């Protein structure tokens, strides 16, 4: 079996910049290596065949090169369409093996999250479960910390985070943090807050509510 190792796993870059992704094979595979592009939620698009040839419809900025065990994808000038995940493949021998991929994302400037909190709606409460949702909107870079305090007591283990893909208009992320609770244990407690730490925030932010408001 031939292993295909991509580097780096991810990379940030800005429009017009020049990026280089590398792949390493555990064995000699001559020039029998291809490269594929995938945007989130979408089917792949084939880019490069036999190490260095553009497939049909692939623009000039893309170029591959390499031989034996050392292969390279080069994009000469990232455009918006080029932010995506790229895979290498060896088909010298079965099994055909892909690399783990390198995710390529847009570098932009710091933007601080707009923070919002949502108590469980009356329709949900009328059903025996409570969901408190903390929304973080349109921020960069992706790293963010969100903590829950219920009557000034810190929670651990009972919240779930989800994060959107880099948005296509402004290149930000958004995040949901959902505190999941029984209708019972949720009404035992009185003040709900989530605290957001983010590099673009001068101070950590808190948004609170009291149950009965």
């Amino acid at each position: 079996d031939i292993q295909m190792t991509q580097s780096p796993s991810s990379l940030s870059a800005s429009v017009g910049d020049r990026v280089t992704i590398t792949c390493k094979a555990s064995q000699n595979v001559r020039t029998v290596v291809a490269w594929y592009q995938q945007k989130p939620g979408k089917a792949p698009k084939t880019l490069i065949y036999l190490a260095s040839n553009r497939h049909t419809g692939v623009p000039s900025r893309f170029s591959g090169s390499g031989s034996g065990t050392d292969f390279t994808l080069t994009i000469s000038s990232l455009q918006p369409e080029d932010f995506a995940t790229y895979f290498c493949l060896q088909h010298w021998s079965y099994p055909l093996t892909f690399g783990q991929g390198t995710k390529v994302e847009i570098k932009r400037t710091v933007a601080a999250p707009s923070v919002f909190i949502f108590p469980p709606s009356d329709e949900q409460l009328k059903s025996g479960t409570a969901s408190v949702v903390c929304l973080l909107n349109n921020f960069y870079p992706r790293e963010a910390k969100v903590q829950w305090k219920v009557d000034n007591a810190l929670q651990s283990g009972n919240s779930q985070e989800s994060v959107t893909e880099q948005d296509s208009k402004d290149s930000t992320y958004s995040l949901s943090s959902t505190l999941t609770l029984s209708k019972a244990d949720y009404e035992k407690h009185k003040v709900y807050a989530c605290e957001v730490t983010h590099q673009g925030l001068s101070s950590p932010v808190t948004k609170s509510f009291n149950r009965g408001e």
């Binding site: 895979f87 055909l96 929304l135």
Partner: protein, 211 residues
């Protein structure tokens, strides 16, 4: 003209069986190797099997040998994947793709296969009301399997919408939220309706978001 349409996916129990079909058009199907490739929900691409142009040779990823059979029908310009003894880790989107100078030279949209012991279940949709720019949304909670769709104002509300990737809860059911941030001045002059669609359980829900 190249067109590839996978079908036959769905949700099945561990140990079950499914047959995928891939209808090929716009290229001389029979002179090319055909392959199946799959992509588990969070992971990278993984080659499954390849059949030679004449059907004389077949090659399999070793974790599917014996359990899966790739075949083709020249009369029908169709490739098939017969899947048996399904495992949870077979859960993936499955693509079929011809080899040219390159494996997988063109890809169809894929077909989603979910192998789980959990039961189908439609979601509940709950408002997240607002109360500068305001923010509002819907909570789409406790469904199985993927996928659901949610839209706002039946596709008229596009900018600043955020539908989050679903997360598997401790109960084994999925849950997400969809939200949008609008100008505050518009609260009142603009109605906000989230349209939730869960085909696997045959569930449709529309919800107005107020106050």
């Amino acid at each position: 003209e190249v067109q590839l349409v996978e079908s036959g996916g769905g949700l099945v129990q561990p140990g079950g069986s499914l047959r995928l079909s891939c209808a090929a058009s716009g290229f001389a199907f029979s002179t090319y190797d055909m392959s199946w490739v799959r992509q588990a929900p969070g992971k990278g691409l993984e080659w499954v099997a390849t059949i030679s142009s004449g059907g004389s040779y077949t090659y399999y990823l070793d974790s599917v040998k014996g359990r899966f059979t790739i075949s083709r029908d020249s009369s029908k310009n169709t490739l098939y994947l017969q899947m048996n003894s399904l495992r949870a880790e077979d859960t993936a989107v499955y693509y079929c793709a011809p080899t040219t100078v390159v494996p997988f030279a063109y890809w169809g949209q894929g077909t989603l296969v979910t192998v789980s012991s959990a039961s189908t279940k439609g979601p509940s949709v709950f408002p997240l009301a607002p109360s500068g720019t305001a923010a509002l949304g819907c909570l789409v909670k406790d469904y199985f399997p993927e996928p659901v769709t949610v839209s706002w104002n039946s596709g008229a509300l596009t900018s600043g919408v955020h539908t989050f990737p679903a997360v598997l809860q401790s109960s084994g059911l999925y849950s997400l939220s969809s939200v949008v941030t609008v100008p505050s001045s518009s609260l009142g002059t603009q109605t906000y309706i989230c349209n939730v669609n869960h085909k696997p359980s045959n569930t449709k829900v529309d919800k107005k978001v107020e106050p």
